[PDB]
Amino acid sequence: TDTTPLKLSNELYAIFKIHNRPYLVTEGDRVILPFKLKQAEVGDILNMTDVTTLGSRNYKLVGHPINTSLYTLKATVVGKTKRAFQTREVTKRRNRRVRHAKSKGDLTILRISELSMN
């Protein structure tokens, strides 16, 4: 795998997958995972492993996943949080009972700190 053009390029993107959910990122990008991370606390660093695609403007390395040796991709866990609280009402059409389906899903804000060809 001649990974020289990617290595050379100033701009570079990745399409890493957390639980088969793809997230297309550059360095500085701020990923918002739609679940509560249990393993990592806030401040902890995540070394991304299942990286599908690593792309320049005109080239892209692709793997299933790409060799961990070829790249780096460090995210930082920058705040567990939640979505806004919502209460949709559930009811049938001639029935006074109206069940409130309250919802407030969890989020985990990551920040892609490092992304480079090793």
Partner 1 sequence: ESELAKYKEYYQGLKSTVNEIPESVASKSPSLRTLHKRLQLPNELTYSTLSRCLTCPSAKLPDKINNPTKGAAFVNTVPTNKYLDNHGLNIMGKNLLSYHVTKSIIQKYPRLPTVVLNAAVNAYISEAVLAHIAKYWGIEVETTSVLSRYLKMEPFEFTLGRLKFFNNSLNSKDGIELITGKNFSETSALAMSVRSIIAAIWAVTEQKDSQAVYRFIDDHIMSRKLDITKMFQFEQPTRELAMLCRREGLEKPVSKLVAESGRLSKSPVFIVHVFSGEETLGEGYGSSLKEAKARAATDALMKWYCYEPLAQQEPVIDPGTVVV
Partner 2 sequence: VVKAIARNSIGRNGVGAFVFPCRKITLQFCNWGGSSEGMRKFLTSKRLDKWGQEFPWIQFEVMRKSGHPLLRAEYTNGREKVICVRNLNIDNVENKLKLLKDSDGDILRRRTKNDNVESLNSSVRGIWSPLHAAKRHR
Partner 3 sequence: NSSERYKLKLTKREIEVLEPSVYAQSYRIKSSMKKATLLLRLLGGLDVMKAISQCHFSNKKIAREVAELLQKGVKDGQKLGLKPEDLYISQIWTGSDGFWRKRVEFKARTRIGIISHPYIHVRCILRTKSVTKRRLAYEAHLKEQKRAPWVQLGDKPIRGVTGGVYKW
Partner RNA sequence: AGUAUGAAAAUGAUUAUUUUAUAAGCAAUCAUGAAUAUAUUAUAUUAUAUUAAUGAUGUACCUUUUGUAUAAUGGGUCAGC
Partner RNA sequence: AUAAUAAUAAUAUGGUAAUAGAACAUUUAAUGAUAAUAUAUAUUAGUUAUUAAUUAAUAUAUGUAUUAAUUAAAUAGAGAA
β-strand partners of 67: none
43 binds, among partner 3, RNA, partner 1, none (CB under 5 to 8 A by kind): none
Q: How far is CA 50 from the centre of its chain?
A: 11
Q: Which of 42, 45, 105, 118 binds RNA (CB under 7 A)?
A: 105
Q: CA–CA distance from 85 to each of 38, 49, 74, 101, 106 (Å)?
A: 21, 33, 31, 11, 10
By the rule CB under 5 A, 100 interacts with Mg ion: no
Considering only residues 38 to 77 of the shown chain, the ones binding RNA according to CB under 7 A are 38
- What CA–CA distance (Å, rounded) separates 117 from 73? 9
Integer Cα distance of 9 and 56 in angstroms: 6
In the list 5, 7, 9, 15, the residue contacting partner 3 (rule: CB under 8 A) is 15
Residue 28 CB, nearest approach to partner 1 (Å) = 6
**x/- map, 59-98, partner 2, by CB under 8 A:** ----------------xx-xxxxxxxxx------------
